[PDB]
Write a structure and sequence with these properties.
By secondary structure, the chain is an alpha+beta fold. The chain has helices spanning 7-23, 100-103, 112-124, 137-145, 147-154; strands spanning 32-38, 43-49, 62-68, 79-82. It has one domain: Ubiquitin Conjugating Enzyme (Roll). It has 5 helices and 4 strands; from the N terminus they run H-E-E-E-E-H-H-H-H. Strand 1 and strand 2 form a beta hairpin. It starts with 6 loop residues before the first helix and ends with a helix. Residues 4-157 form the UBC core domain. Pfam families: UQ_con (PF00179).
């Protein structure tokens, strides 16, 4: 890895910042990103609310994420990681997600914003529909057989 100008990381950060400041003036189904700090242009730390809609946006808790880029962006998209623990079939105890979640659908055309919205929605809102991106099968089994007890458990931690 090297700390190098990337035309598209910078262009996509400027675009996210513009959207995050348009959002924080006005959906219960969408997740709101409300802070974007960086640590090198290659590492974006975000603060997020899940949708009021979901199990995960109940007490309006904050969720912290890391978006990590490589020198090859936009050819490969960044990795999203939860810094906040999240009980989920799609997230590990490390905060990892399967690369497939993002990589099956990536074209270099798309923006860091699009990647971030896809992941937040997938995990907070579209989790019930299983694909090839399950990383925590104890959480999947538990949702599948105790839908209601899985909810009470998300509000715990």
């Amino acid at each position: 890895m090297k700390n190098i100008s990337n035309k598209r990381i910078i262009k996509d950060l400027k675009l996210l910042l513009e959207e995050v400041d348009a959002n924080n003036e006005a959906s219960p189904h969408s997740t709101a990103i409300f802070s974007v700090d960086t640590d090198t242009i290659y590492n974006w730390i975000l603060k997020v609310k899940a949708p009021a809609d979901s199990v995960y946006g109940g007490a309006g808790n904050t969720y912290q994420l890391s978006v990590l880029f490589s020198d090859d962006y936009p050819h490969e998209p960044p990795t999203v990681r939860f810094v906040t623990p999240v009980y989920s079939p799609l997230v590990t105890g490390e905060g990892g997600i399967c690369d497939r979640m993002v990589n099956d659908f990536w074209t270099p055309d798309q923006h860091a914003s699009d990647v971030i919205k896809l992941v937040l929605d997938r995990v907070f809102s579209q989790y019930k529909s299983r694909r090839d991106d399950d990383v925590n099968p104890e959480a999947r089994h538990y949702l599948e057989k105790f839908p209601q007890d899985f909810a009470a458990r998300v509000r715990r931690g």
